[PDB]
């Protein structure tokens, strides 16, 4: 599977230009919790999709991109406003990395005093990494009201983020910012929009293929039934 | 209105916004003036539409540098026509970053024209070092991919070529127009920007929100004069 690049960070290469990382960080009362993200590389320029929970781990990751990939991190896109998405944005901004996100994520970050991504979109936005398309789509609420997905057309790889659960997952998880009623519909749109997905990376846990989508949908619907009757 | 050169003049609309008019010849029609915008924040500038060519674009960009002491770092074209992206080649050679309707990008690619970098489909708010540049695609009009750029902190709308100045009587170049969709787009624009202080068209004098209704009338009148 992966390769360690820190005592807490491991990385898995999915394609010549795409890698997915696993960042482990302690969360009070849950021990070391892993969160996923992506590193996309084109012409020695890199895009980081989600940051680890803090600056320190984000800096480790970016230093690896420089030291081992000989790439400069120029681009950043977060899945949503949670920590496993923008926990390291303060460091990236100190470093001059440009950012793009769902306009909803920007409003939420501003409202909450968190580091704020620069450019906001409402429907879709294809960020060009020196000619390589990183297609960002907001298809509706799910795990978080502002959650988006990032599709890499040239690679057939989808970083669906936290709205998607890994195959070993059995619970809906943290729903404090979720839109459980919209969530199954959002998954339906994801399924239909990216039928050629070869790799599908969730916000936490092992990546897989398109089955993660149906897997997640069953979890949300089971959650809905469980908390509705009797 | 200040003269930048014999073929380019610029008018300041607010502390942070300027509108330029550059004159270039259209094969078979003579000299035609086209409009664009210069928005400035913390010595960084956004150019909305470029003159018809690299030469004129470079002239304008050096003036922003020397007279306005701002560096152009950002670019947004109204659509794929020359009066929007004619000087994109030069801008890209200068390291200027660009955002545009995805439609504009696809059109520029299929035509072998300079291609903007980042494409959006509904709306996009570009941050000029904190100053918002709100871009919206509200439907086809003068061109199928035409958008508008709203400056919320200024109440200034660069509507582009989908809008005509007050003196206009004709619909103008409609070779890439979506005439039947156009009035519907103007309705969407009207409902969306009732607070406009300045409304700048792709060609002609800028005015107020009245250019939107005026244009709707021109497009409708056109539809009539060709249906008798
Ligand atoms: Na993440
Ligand atoms: Na123009
Ligand atoms: Zn989350
Ligand atoms: Zn998460
Ligand atoms: Zn045009
Ligand atoms: Zn025009």
From Swiss-Prot, chain A:
Its cofactor is Zn(2+). It catalyses: a beta-lactam + H2O = a substituted beta-amino acid. Transmembrane segments: none annotated. Keywords: Antibiotic resistance, Hydrolase, Metal-binding, Periplasm, Signal, Zinc. It is an enzyme of class 3 (hydrolase). Binds 2 Zn(2+) ions per subunit. It can also bind Cd(2+) and Co(2+) to a lesser extent. One of its GO terms (molecular function) is beta-lactamase activity. Belongs to the metallo-beta-lactamase superfamily. Class-B beta-lactamase family. PANTHER family: ACYL-COENZYME A THIOESTERASE MBLAC2, METALLO-BETA-LACTAMASE DOMAIN-CONTAINING. This is Metallo-beta-lactamase type 2. It comes from Bacteroides fragilis. The gene is ccrA.
């Amino acid at each position: 599977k992966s390769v360690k690049i820190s005592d807490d960070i491991s990385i898995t290469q999915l394609s010549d230009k795409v890698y997915t990382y696993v960042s482990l960080a302690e969360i009070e009362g849950w021990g070391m919790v892993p969160s996923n993200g992506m590193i996309v590389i084109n012409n020695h320029q890199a895009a980081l999709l989600d940051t680890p929970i803090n600056d320190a781990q984000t800096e480790m990751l970016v230093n690896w991109v420089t030291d081992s990939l000989h790439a400069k991190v120029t681009t950043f896109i977060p899945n949503h406003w949670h920590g496993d998405c923008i926990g390291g944005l303060g460091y990236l901004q100190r470093k001059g990395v440009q950012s793009y996100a769902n306009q909803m994520t920007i409003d939420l970050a501003k409202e909450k005093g968190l580091p704020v991504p620069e450019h906001g979109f409402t429907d879709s936005l294809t960020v060009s990494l020196d000619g390589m398309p990183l297609q960002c789509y907001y298809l509706g609420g799910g795990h978080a009201t502002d959650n988006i997905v990032v599709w890499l057309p040239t690679e057939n790889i989808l970083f669906g983020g936290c709205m998607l659960k890994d195959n070993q997952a059995t619970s809906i998880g943290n729903i404090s910012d979720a839109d459980v009623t919209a969530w199954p519909k959002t998954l339906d749109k994801v399924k239909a929009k990216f039928p050629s997905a070869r790799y599908v990376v969730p916000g936490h846990g092992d990546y897989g293929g398109t089955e993660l989508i149906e897997h997640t949908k069953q979890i949300v619907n089971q959650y809905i039934e469980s908390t509705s009757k009797p």
